[PDB]
Amino acid sequence: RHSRRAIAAETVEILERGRYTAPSGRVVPIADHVAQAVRGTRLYRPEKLAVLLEGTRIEVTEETTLAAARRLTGAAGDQVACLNFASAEHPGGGFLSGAHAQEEGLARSSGLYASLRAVPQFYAFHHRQRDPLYSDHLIYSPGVPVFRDDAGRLLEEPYRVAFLTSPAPNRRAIGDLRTVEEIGRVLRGRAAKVLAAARHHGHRRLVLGAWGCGVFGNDPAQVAETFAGLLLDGGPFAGRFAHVVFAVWDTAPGAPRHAAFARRF
Ligand SMILES: Nc1ncnc2c1ncn2[C@@H]1O[C@H](COP(=O)(O)OP(=O)(O)OC[C@H]2O[C@H](O)[C@H](O)[C@@H]2O)[C@@H](O)[C@H]1O
């Protein structure tokens, strides 16, 4: 936790100063790309995403979100979109306190916090709503520079991805006071909107994963099935993306989140 906290603070310094020093000693400028990502950030309300919905190579890997994004970005020039397994309440989650989950890693490693912190309306909505189902609001962050690897080392050459920030329902907080089917309906509607936003912004390659299945306590079989219903068996997004990676990095014994996705896809 202390090392993660230090890295988070360094990233905030980097985002203020507009440059960082790579391990070779190269000084890498990022201010322009960070500013572009912030200025291009958009909040989508639930009903705007619903309007989009009126209008494939599938891999399951043990990669982190960022590792999969980096791999894809090296292989072709179209910008990849990645799902941020978002906090509804804090931009970058607990990253500055050294918390360890997917969003925090994204915030430690990229310009994502600079984008998310600029959308206070998203966070205010959820704070006032006080319901752990959260909502279908989504933040779209284009061209966010990524400048660390999985170990926290700064990159000689940063790369850019789009982020899609949408919180899964907090099933852990709900317990059994919503049914399996109610949670499934919420997951399906929201995931459909995430995919619609990605496609609307021209992203043909996605990095998805076990959204909601760690800190938020969702069932990975249900989340894998949610994506499967959208992408397979003639579902609404069947054939609409070129490449979808379920990058599932699960350090728990048995890697159960990864196993559920491997089984389904
Ligand atoms: N870097 C990663 N890359 C890919 N998969 C990962 C990674 N880290 C974890 N996983 C796997 O993917 C699963 C889900 O990762 P989780 O980060 O718990 O997402 P949530 O949507 O349930 O929790 C969101 C909250 O956690 C944050 O604090 C936020 O700010 C929110 O407050 C894990 O169980 C792992 O199997």
Residue 74, Cα to own-chain centre: how many angstroms? 19
**Ligand 1 pocket, mutate which of 149, 211, 215, 227 (most atoms under 8 A from CB):** 215
Cβ 217 vs Cβ 170: under 8 Å: yes
Using CA atoms, how far apart are residues 71 and 141, in angstroms rounded to an integer? 20
- The secondary structure element, H or E, covering residue 246 is strand 243-247
Q: Which two tokens stand for residue 53?
A: 């919905």
Residue pair 198/69 in contact by the 8 Å Cβ criterion? no
Is the Cβ atom of 94 under 6 angstroms away from ligand 1?
Answer: yes
CATH number, domain 1-265: 3.40.220.10
CB 222 within 8 A of CB 212: no
The response to whether residue 103 sits with its C-beta less than 6 Å from ligand 1 reads yes
Kindly provide the residue ranges of all beta strands, DSSP E only, lying in 112-174, ordered along the sequence: 138-148, 154-166
- Spatial strand order of the sheet with 81-85 comes to 42-44, 138-148, 154-166, 81-85, 205-208, 243-247, 57-61
What is the spatial distance between Cα 73 and Cα 42, in angstroms, rounded to a whole number?
Answer: 22
Shortest-distance atom of ligand 1 to CA 256: 36
CA distances from 167 to 26, 89, 134, 179 (A): 36, 9, 7, 19
Buried b (16+ CB within 10 A) or exposed e, 7-32: bbeebbebbeeeebeeeeeeebebee
Query: Phi/psi at 227 (nearest 5 deg)?
Result: -65, -40
Say yes or no: CB of residue 216 within 6 Å of ligand 1.
Answer: yes
Closest CA to 158 of 28, 50, 257, 254: 28
> How far does CA 27 lie from the centroid of its chain?
28
247 near 265, Cβ under 8 Å? no
Query: Between helices 2-17 and 102-109, what is the axis angle to 10°?
Result: 40
CA 185 to chain centre: 20
Ligand 1 in reach of 215 Cβ (< 6 A): yes
Q: Check: CB of residue 230 under 8 Å from CB of residue 195.
A: yes
Contacts of 49 (CB under 8 A, 6+ apart): 136, 138, 193, 196, 197
Spatial distance between the Cα atoms of 150 and 63, rounded to a whole number of angstroms: 10
CB 85 less than 6 A from any atom of ligand 1 = yes
Ligand 1 centre and the CA of 85: distance in Å? 6
- The resolution, in angstroms to one decimal, equals 1.3
Taking CA atoms, 234 is separated from 80, 239, 246, in Å, by 24, 9, 19
Q: How open is the CA angle 65-114-81, to the nearest 5 degrees?
A: 35
CB distance 64 to ligand 1 below 6 Å:
yes
Q: What angle, rounded to 10 degrees, do the helices at 220-231 and 180-200 form? A: 50
Q: How far apart are CA 153 and CA 155, in angstroms?
A: 6
- CA 260 / ligand 1 centre spacing (Å): 15
